[PDB]
Every structure is written in structure tokens, then in C-alpha cells.
Amino acid sequence: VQDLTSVVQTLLQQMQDKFQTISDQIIGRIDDMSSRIDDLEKNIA
Amino acid sequence: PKTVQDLTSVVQTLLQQMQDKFQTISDQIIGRIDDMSSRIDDLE
Amino acid sequence: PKTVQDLTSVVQTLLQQMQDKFQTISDQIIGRIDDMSSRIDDLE
Amino acid sequence: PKTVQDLTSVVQTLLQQMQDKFQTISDQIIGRIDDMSSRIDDLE
Amino acid sequence: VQDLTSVVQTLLQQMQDKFQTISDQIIGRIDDMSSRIDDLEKNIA
Amino acid sequence: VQDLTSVVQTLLQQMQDKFQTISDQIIGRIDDMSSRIDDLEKNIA
């Protein structure tokens, strides 16, 4: 009954964690790329 | 605006209304047995 | 640690316990009919 | 190829077959009461 | 009964909106980064 | 009964495929951007 509500709560909370995992992974890469771009623009300037 | 809770108050309502439907049928059956028990009463 | 399976063993338990509840009520009804059939027996 | 609809035609089938199972048991009970009502008939 | 189908439809439509939100957020950043990279390559060239 | 478990398994497996689709799409873009940044840093250097 409530064991329903949690088994749904879990299945969904795992699917979103996986989502976060790939995302956080991506944003980290973009953050490092932006860092490099900043320096590139700074250098030529 | 809906969370898991909401989902489990739908599933709880469903099951309730489904128990309601069957206890209702059992009640009508019990009603029939009661009348039969009165006739048997008035026979013994 | 839960997969879809888990979800369908909750839904299966729910439905079971709900069949259990109604067969139980039917059994008590059948019990009542049995006593009435004995009185009728002892009347015929 | 499945959407929410699909999910709610499974849940609707489940509940149906579960109502079918209990009305069936009620019917057999009603059947028993009918025979008892005939014996009582043939006693009064 | 149908109130089931919607409560599932919603819980899922919220989880995907959150997904879109982070994504659209990310693609926007990449789009601006590509813009800068284009200019960097154009300049040195 | 099991037809439940699959209809849930599917609805969820589609929502994650869509997720992957956008992601794989994004990572590919970042991978090409990193490639260009590498070359930009290599050139000025």
C-alpha cells in the first residue's frame, strides 16, 4: 500500500540519479572547456 | 502538483471502492440468509 | 535496490490479500448456509 | 509502443478479472441459497 | 481509474521537464561556447 | 500481472532512451568542441 508508494519512489529516484550522473558529468566538462576558451581569448587578446 | 503520495491515494481509493463493492454484495447475500432463517424459524 | 519486478510483487501481494479478504467473507457466508442446511435437515 | 493508456488498460483488466472472480463466488453462493429456498418451499 | 493514468502521466511529465530544463540549459551553454570557438579559429586564421 | 511489469518497464525504458538520445547528442558536440579547443591551444602555442 505504502510499500507501493516507495517502490515507485525508488524506481523513479534511480532513473533521475542516473540522469544527474551523466549531467553533472557533462557540466563538469563544459566548465573545464569554458575555462580553456577564456584563456584562449585572453591570450590572443 | 502531484507526487508519489497522490499515486498511492488513487490506488487506495480504487481498492477501497472495490472492497466496498464486494462487501455490498456480501451484505445482500447475508440479507437473503436472514429472511431464510426467519422462515426456518417459523417452521421449527 | 528495486526494479520493476519489485513493483509487481507489491501489486501481486495487494491483489492476493484482497482476494484473501473476500474469500474469507464468502467462507463465513458458506458457514452460515451450512448451519441452515442442518436445521433444514433436522426439519425434513 | 506503449503509453500511459496501455498502463491503465492493464490496471482495468486486472480489477475487472478480480471483480469477475468475486461475483462468480457470490453467484455460487446465491445458487446454494436458491436450492435451500426450494427445500424450505417444499417444507412450508 | 483514469485518475490513475493521469497521476502517472504527471509524475512522469514532471521528471522529463526537469530533464529538459537541465538539457536546454546545457545546450545553450554549448551553443555560446561554439560561438566563441568559431571566433577564436577565425581570428588566428 | 506481469503485463503490468512490462508496461511499466517500457514506459520507463522509453523515457530513458529519449534521455540518452539528447545526452549522446550533447556529448558528441562537446567531443568535437574539445577537439577544436585542443587545436586552438596547440596553434597559439
Q: Which of 11-40 (D) contact F at CB < 8 A?
A: 11, 14
Terminal Cα-to-Cα distance of chain F (whole angstroms):
65
Give me the CATH code for the D1-44 domain, please. 1.20.5.430
Cα distances (Å, whole numbers) of residue C36 to B4, D14, D32, E40? 49, 35, 11, 96
The three cell numbers of residue A12 are 523513479
The answer to whether residue A4 neighbours chain E at the CB level (below 8 Å) is no
Q: Resolution in angstroms, to 1 decimal, for this deposition?
A: 1.8
Contact A11, C4 (CB under 8 A): yes
Contact residues on chain C for F8, CB-CB shorter than 8 A: 4, 7-8
Q: How many Å apart are CA A1 and CA D42, to the nearest integer?
A: 50
- CATH fold of A1-45: 1.20.5
Cβ-Cβ contacts under 8 Å for C9 (sequence gap 6 or more): none
Q: Do E34 and F30 touch (CB under 8 A)?
A: no
Contact residues on chain D for F2, CB-CB shorter than 8 A: none
Q: How many Å apart are CA C17 and CA C13, to the nearest integer?
A: 6
